[PDB]
Design a binder for this molecule. Structure first.
Ligand code: HEM
Ligand code: HEM
Ligand SMILES: [O]
Ligand SMILES: [O]
Lengths: 153, 153
């Protein structure tokens, strides 16, 4: 994973990307298609393009490059936000508090019980299943950080 | 990992939690500590709490309950935001376009090339390493969705 400064570096350079997203998107796809021409075959609209000049002249290529970099930017930003909260929690619970995954299972059990007890009208079988799944995602994401850190959990 | 309706159900019950985060948190920790007393042994600052009534009386147990559920809610919500960004892309790239991970590697390297080419002062060695790592996280996250969707990338 990335450190906090590395995430900020990603954000900073993406701001440059978004300041000229059309130019960046064009250049990315041109680099892809010239370096790896087989990738062109995936694109009905593009697969006839043979030269960088032809690629730069394609309005369809330019708008697709923007679509790609817009989508990737959002994924990167949202990953960064999740990481910024997950990472410190995994770090402290692995290295200072030394909390095994089974104990995260136990608190998940308690959360499910408390929610069912307090809010049965908002916690029927499907909603309880949803929360059970969500808490498992959380535990798994912590466990993956534990493994990176070397903590048995 | 959850459907859209399941995420809605999670966020709906979480809104109920947020109407009294401290009460919910207190109740979760007391459930945990009463059911699994070894978990209370991890909290050196709660060594004075032995009985259920003592737990109920503790200002700091309740405050810690707030800390725990505030953190968990942020992580759950941010996971949901990231999932929702990954979802449309993994759907199409697995099931319609059928883009191998090797082609995602190619476009990742193309992005790094373009950023180096365009911004060498800003996008030096460390920032390039950051972006390289971030794009690997992206590819691995899509690869995990591919396997859930039955697509060998
Ligand atoms: C950073 C990686 C990538 C991102 C963020 C990305 C994003 C997108 C987006 C947002 C769309 C339009 C909506 C959709 O169909 O999902 C799209 C379409 C498509 N992508 Fe990707 N893509 C990536 C990599 C690739 C690669 C490497 C290839 C092929 C070698 C590819 C092939 C396609 C194809 C064929 C379409 C449909 C084009 C059309 O019919 O207009 N994608 N991509
Ligand atoms: C939903 C799961 C959990 C969440 C979101 C959570 C959250 C937190 C947060 C936000 C802190 C303060 C900042 C930090 O040190 O990271 C904390 C501290 C701590 N957590 Fe957790 N925690 C969870 C589960 C557990 C479990 C199950 C245990 C023990 C069995 C545990 C033991 C501790 C301890 C010992 C501290 C330090 C308390 C003190 O300040 O003295 N945590 N936790
Ligand atoms: O794409
Ligand atoms: O905690």
């Amino acid at each position: 994973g990335l450190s906090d400064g590395e995430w900020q570096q990603v954000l900073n350079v993406w701001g440059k990307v978004e300041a000229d997203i059309a130019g960046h998107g064009q250049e990315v796809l041109i680099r892809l298609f010239t370096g790896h021409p087989e990738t062109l075959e995936k694109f009905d609209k593009f697969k006839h393009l043979k030269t960088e000049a032809e690629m730069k002249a394609s309005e369809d290529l330019k708008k697709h490059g923007t679509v790609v970099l817009t989508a990737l930017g959002g994924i990167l930003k949202k990953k960064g936000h999740h990481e910024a909260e997950l990472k410190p929690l995994a770090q402290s619970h692995a290295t200072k508090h030394k909390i095994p995954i089974k104990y995260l299972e136990f608190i998940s059990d308690a959360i499910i019980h408390v929610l069912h007890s307090k809010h049965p009208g908002d916690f029927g079988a499907d909603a309880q299943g949803a929360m059970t799944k969500a808490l498992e995602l959380f535990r798994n994401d912590i466990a993956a950080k534990y493994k990176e850190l070397g903590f048995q959990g």
